[PDB]
Design a protein around this ligand. Structure first.
Ligand SMILES: CCC(CC)O[C@@H]1C=C(C(=O)O)C[C@H](N)[C@H]1NC(C)=O
Ligand SMILES: [Ca+2]
Ligand SMILES: [Ca+2]
Ligand SMILES: [Ca+2]
Ligand SMILES: [Ca+2]
Length: 749
């Protein structure tokens, strides 16, 4: 909430015409002045000041969420120039004056001594005076003069005064000052009310002042997937930098006509090229979702986006991108074991045959597709090498073959075709129609087609969409995992019931997946520093989404290199595992995540780690950072870069936010928000903190406490050259707006 006085020239320029109450005594007075229009306070032989009354609830909001008072004035003479705020019990009182040398000085009630602010002709010229109050158990204000920190940790002092005040607050002491502008802002206006939840926010650089915020509208409350709620995506827009907001708009009820769905996790990206907001969100059937792993691949989970045209205020109807981002496959994780499927066949080695296998290599090695024709065996083994390239080894041939070096292509599906020539008794491998090589395989009496992960001592994971075997104009074998993966449970999908033999050693997991994809909470980004990042590009839209294969959550990039027309997925985060007992996996589950592009084009990602945090005695904490050096395709776990780097961060699991802040001089740093807990560094969703990184995410300074009270999910975005805007869940999950003077606050560090 903003309470202000602005002199414009309009002879409404009286503070009285702008809601202020004249409070003069004796000969105290005031008059409009126009050097540039201003109100001249004339506290000559009397008091001359202006006041504004606030409600109990307004004072309480100010106490819980902070406030700031900004004055542009010049002091002409005298003293007791008192611009301040008093809430009925306490106040922070700066007293500004000209001293006996004509120097402009300030002193504070409750602190010792004075500070010179300006000397010479500067003392009686206009300046900008800012008081910023940060809430907390032991709260304090800081005072700034033309943007520079003058005094910090100014603790409030007792006063029964109850008003916003500016001018010359003394009858017995002359003071004369001209005011161009007074702004008192109470932080924390409610923008979305609980039990709505899960906020995100972005701001338009092309149209300064435009801010677009999102949440889940939860009729009935609670997470998606409950029969007792119908959840939609809602949005509001500000055009004055987040002070006022237009009408709450339900973006998804138009595609939720029978309340058959829940939508969740609005993830906006601001696009400066089109000046648009593209917000992606999850769809779920209303009665099943991510919680409990209840969502299944045959159910209508997917991802849609809506586009806001900032220039017109138009919201475009939702667009479904589920087919592009929700993989359908049979997945074999040969992690600590091997798992192969073999279909015995009756190939005639004296006739040609052909096979096709559509396969994605997720990680590792010993991933195989094999055909044996009763005379010879042909095996292609697919691995990820040290530099993250895709490599083929053929049985009987010493030299490996590099198939791909570009990381997106390394982990995408490819068609592996074997063409056997009876005449030469050799087989030619084609990959995506490209002839790769010809080899003779090995002698064998086996007669089958076989695929999976082949070695219990070599970890690998491969996903399969199609397998075909053909001879003499007939398909002998056909397996369409892409089709089967999305069928309901009454369609037979068990390979062992479909004529395949399962050959498993040790511990493995396999499944048809994925069960769901979810953009996750917060916003995404457009990349602009990718020039020297091989295989990547500027203009990429990207966000870190949550994928559930069947039972385990993890994070992968979802991105578009054509402005949002077509979307692609990257690899999931690399995480440790351990089999604590047969078929019981100890591992991590990264879920709610946020990423930022560093100065060198590397991407820094911070992820909430849910459920178990400990693998082989190693505690990864409730939060873990990851780094991508290839534009978001693949990631690396940053050792010892977890919750530990955010001093006094809360110890409970919760969504966080991260973003880049750029100053007018081109300097930059990172901002991060998360509760501290109360006390700081304990469990609760209380006391939102702000952390800074001036070194590309290696260390973090802070926190600066932003909120005194409930603080759960949050999102932070740069608002302008000097401010960041924060949306944060608070009491009863009520989402509130903070507008934080970052360039001021950083000076407290
Ligand atoms: C994925 C993180 C977590 C796993 C327990 O679930 C989230 C936690 C939440 C929470 O801790 O408050 C609320 C989120 N809306 C929920 N996500 C979904 C899709 O229901
Ligand atoms: Ca409805
Ligand atoms: Ca529901
Ligand atoms: Ca987030
Ligand atoms: Ca699970």
């Amino acid at each position: 909430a903003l309470f202000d006085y602005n002199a414009t020239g309009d002879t409404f320029d009286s503070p009285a015409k702008q809601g202020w109450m004249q409070d003069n005594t004796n000969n105290g007075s005031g008059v409009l002045t126009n050097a540039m229009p201003a109100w001249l306070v004339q506290g000559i032989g009397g008091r001359a000041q202006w006041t504004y009354s606030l409600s109990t609830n307004q004072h309480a909001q100010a106490s819980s969420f902070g406030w700031r008072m900004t004055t542009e004035m010049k002091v002409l003479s005298g003293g007791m120039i008192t611009n301040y705020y008093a809430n009925g019990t306490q106040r922070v009182l700066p007293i500004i004056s000209l001293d006996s040398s004509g120097n402009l000085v300030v002193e504070f009630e409750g602190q010792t001594g004075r500070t010179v602010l300006a000397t010479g002709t500067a003392a009686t010229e206009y300046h900008k005076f800012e008081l910023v109050f940060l809430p907390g158990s032991n709260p304090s204000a800081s005072f700034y003069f033309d943007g520079k920190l003058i005094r910090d940790n100014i603790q409030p002092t007792a006063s029964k005064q109850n008003m916003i005040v500016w001018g010359n607050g003394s009858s017995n002491t002359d003071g004369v000052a001209a005011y161009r502008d007074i702004k008192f802002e109470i932080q924390g206006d409610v923008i979305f009310r609980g039990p709505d939840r899960i906020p995100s926010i972005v701001a338009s650089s092309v149209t300064p002042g435009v801010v677009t915020a999102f949440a889940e509208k939860r009729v009935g409350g609670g997470d998606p997937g409950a029969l007792s709620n119908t959840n939609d995506i809602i949005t509001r827009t500000s055009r004055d930098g987040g002070i006022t907001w237009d009408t709450e708009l339900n973006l998804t009820e138009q595609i939720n006509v029978s309340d058959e769905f829940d939508f969740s996790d609005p993830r906006p990206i601001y696009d400066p090229s089109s000046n648009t907001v593209l917000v992606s969100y999850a769809r779920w059937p209303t009665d099943a979702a991510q919680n409990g792993d209840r969502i299944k691949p045959w159910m209508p989970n997917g991802i849609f986006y809506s586009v806001y045209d900032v220039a017109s205020g138009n919201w475009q109807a939702p667009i479904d991108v589920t087919d592009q981002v929700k993989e359908r496959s049979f997945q074999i994780a040969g992690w600590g074991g091997s798992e192969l499927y073999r279909r015995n066949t009756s190939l005639n080695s004296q006739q040609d045959w052909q096979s096709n296998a559509k396969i994605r290599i997720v990680d590792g090695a010993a991933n195989q597709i094999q055909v044996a024709d009763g005379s010879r065996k042909y095996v292609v083994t697919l691995s990820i090498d040290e530099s993250g390239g895709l490599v083929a080894n053929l049985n009987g041939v010493s030299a490996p073959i590099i198939l791909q070096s570009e990381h997106a292509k390394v982990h995408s599906f490819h068609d592996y075709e074997l063409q056997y020539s009876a005449l030469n008794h050799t087989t030619t491998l084609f990959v995506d129609g490209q002839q790769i090589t010809t080899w003779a395989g090995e002698v064998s009496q086996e007669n089958n087609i076989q695929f999976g992960n082949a070695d219990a001592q070599i970890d690998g994971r491969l996903h399969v969409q199609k397998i075909v075997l053909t001879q003499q104009g007939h398909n002998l074998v056909e397996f369409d995992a892409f089709y089967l993966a999305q069928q309901t449970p009454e369609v037979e999908k068990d390979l062992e019931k479909l004529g395949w033999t399962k050959i498993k050693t040790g511990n493995t997991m396999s499944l048809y997946g994925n069960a769901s994809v979810n953009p996750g909470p917060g916003h995404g980004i457009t990349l602009t520093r990718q020039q020297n990042i091989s295989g990547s590009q500027n203009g990429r839209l990207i966000y870190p989404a949550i994928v559930l294969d069947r039972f385990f959550l993890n994070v992968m990039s979802i991105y578009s290199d054509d402005g949002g027309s077509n979307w692609q997925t990257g690899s999931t985060l690399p995480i440790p595992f351990r089999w604590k007992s047969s078929s019981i996996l100890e591992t991590l589950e990264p879920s709610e995540a946020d990423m930022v592009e560093l100065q060198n084009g590397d991407l820094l990602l911070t992820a909430r780690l849910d459920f178990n945090q400990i693998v082989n005695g190693v505690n990864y904490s409730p939060r873990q950072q990851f780094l991508s050096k290839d534009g978001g395709i693949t990631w690396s776990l940053l050792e010892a870069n977890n919750a530990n780097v955010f001093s006094n961060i809360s110890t409970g699991t919760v969504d966080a936010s991260i973003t880049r802040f750029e100053q007018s001089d081109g300097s930059h740093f990172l901002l991060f928000t998360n509760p501290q807990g109360n006390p700081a560094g304990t469990n609760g969703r209380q006391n939102l903190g702000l952390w800074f990184s001036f070194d590309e995410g290696v260390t973090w300074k802070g926190p600066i406490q932003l909120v005194n009270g409930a603080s759960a999910y949050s999102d932070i975005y740069q608002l302008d050259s000097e401010n960041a805007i924060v949306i944060v869940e608070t009491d009863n999950s009520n989402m509130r707006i903070l507008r934080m003077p970052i360039t001021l606050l950083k000076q407290k560090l």
